[PDB]
Write a protein that binds this ligand. Structure first.
Ligand code: A1IOR
Ligand code: CL
Length: 410
């Protein structure tokens, strides 16, 4: 059973929908700025990718919204955009065949931090009654199903940077194997609180380029110093092909492959050859029935880390051989930063749009490619080119790897 993309939705540091975000991507625009919503003078990193000007009231009543952490509000916004974009009418004849898989890396950290402050100052009577339902990761899937009447498979992944990739891949598996005809899948993140910036800062994971936030995210650049923490959400409507065809749906692209692997190497550090990423990409290509030479575009994991970026080049060279010099690969995290559990979702949308528009997004900030970083990394400016097959990679903490493969639809 074939799986197509019929609807997409997004909040990112570049825009409050897909068209606005993609316009930013193609123009080489950074969404990274000093963070406004808290005082970070004690933190080593004081900048990130925030969602600008979000109005939850476009999606939910002020009543419903006050009960939900920002990561849920973001996930719901993306989901509602995707469902609307799909044109699907939910009925009694199909509602059991429509499910949801929206994940998060960290979930309701802001809500946890604020409730923790009330707990320590006052005691447990100050904890919100909506604290649990409004903070737990599966409540994007939960609330979406309730609002739209979706009675199909209902779950949530939490796999760090791989969350959105795994969410989409496993949703596509549900449709492929007949457990559902439609799935809303992707991920959401809002970890820009004291615990998030302080936590990743304590692990020395973040860029500390406070003087030039728009230059901080620089995948494959010799002066990269860690990732940029970013917020938002991505959602796709995945649909069985015959189901989509029958209702006259607009098909953006086909989801042809999903691969997974584990490094089984280290908690935060990748193998220097990227062997786990290599296995993952090969698993996805095998799943899609594609040779490496059929790949035209890779949306890289490319988080702007010393070890991670070079390991991904190594894995691409291993998988693609001489064809590694013919494909284009870029990291849109150059512009968006690292959306953690949303990264795979937004990057899947950017991969589908590279197929729609026949354009490889840039890697901005790639001033001085490091040793070995000699592929077409689409430095600086978008590249019009032929793109039949687009791959999206995500490699998360714990060495958990996921690859999606999208194809132009015939
Ligand atoms: C986090 C930092 C302090 C340490 C380190 O520099 C880093 O970036 N580790 C990244 C992980 C994700 N994996 C990859 O990037 C990757 C590339 C090729 N194959 N895997 C390994 C587990 C997280
Ligand atoms: Cl370890």
């Amino acid at each position: 059973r074939r799986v197509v993309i019929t609807g997409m939705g997004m909040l990112s540091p570049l825009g409050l929908d897909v068209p606005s975000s993609w316009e930013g991507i193609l123009a080489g625009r950074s969404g990274i700025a000093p963070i406004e919503h808290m005082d970070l003078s004690a933190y080593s990193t004081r900048f990130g990718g925030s969602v600008k000007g979000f109005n939850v009231e476009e999606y939910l009543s002020a009543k419903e919204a006050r009960k939900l952490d920002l990561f849920i509000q973001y996930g719901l916004a993306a989901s509602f955009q995707a469902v609307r974009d799909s044109g699907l009418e939910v009925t009694d004849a199909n509602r059991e065949r429509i499910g949801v898989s929206m994940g998060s890396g960290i979930g309701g950290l802001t809500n946890i931090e604020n409730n923790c402050r009330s707990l320590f100052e006052q005691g447990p009577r100050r904890i919100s009654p909506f604290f649990v339902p409004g903070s737990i990761i599966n409540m994007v899937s939960g609330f979406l199903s309730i609002h739209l009447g979706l009675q199909g498979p209902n779950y949530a992944l939490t796999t760090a940077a791989t969350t959105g990739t795994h969410s989409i891949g496993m949703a596509a598996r549900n449709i492929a194997y007949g457990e559902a005809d439609v799935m809303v899948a992707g991920g959401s993140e809002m970890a820009a609180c004291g615990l998030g910036l302080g936590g990743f800062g304590a692990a020395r994971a973040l860029s500390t380029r406070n003087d030039e936030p728009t230059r901080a995210s620089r995948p494959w650049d010799r002066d990269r110093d860690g990732f940029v923490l970013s917020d938002g959400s991505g959602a796709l409507v995945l649909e069985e092909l015959e189901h989509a065809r029958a209702r006259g749906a607009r098909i953006y692209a086909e989801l042809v492959g999903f691969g997974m692997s584990g490094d089984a190497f280290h908690m935060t550090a990748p193998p220097e050859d990227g062997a786990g990423a290599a296995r993952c990409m090969k698993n996805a290509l095998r799943d899609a029935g594609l040779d490496p030479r059929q790949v035209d575009y890779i949306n890289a994991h490319g988080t702007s880390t010393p070890a991670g970026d070079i390991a991904e080049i190594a894995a691409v060279k291993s998988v693609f051989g001489e064809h590694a010099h013919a494909l284009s690969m870029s990291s849109t995290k150059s512009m968006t930063g690292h959306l953690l559990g949303a990264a795979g979702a937004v990057e899947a949308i950017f991969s589908v749009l590279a197929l729609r528009d026949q354009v490889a997004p840039p890697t901005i900030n790639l001033d001085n490619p490091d040793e070995g970083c000699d592929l077409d990394l689409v430095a600086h400016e978008a590249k019009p080119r032929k793109i039949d097959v687009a791959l999206s990679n995500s490699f998360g903490f714990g060495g958990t790897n996921g690859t999606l493969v999208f194809r132009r639809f015939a």
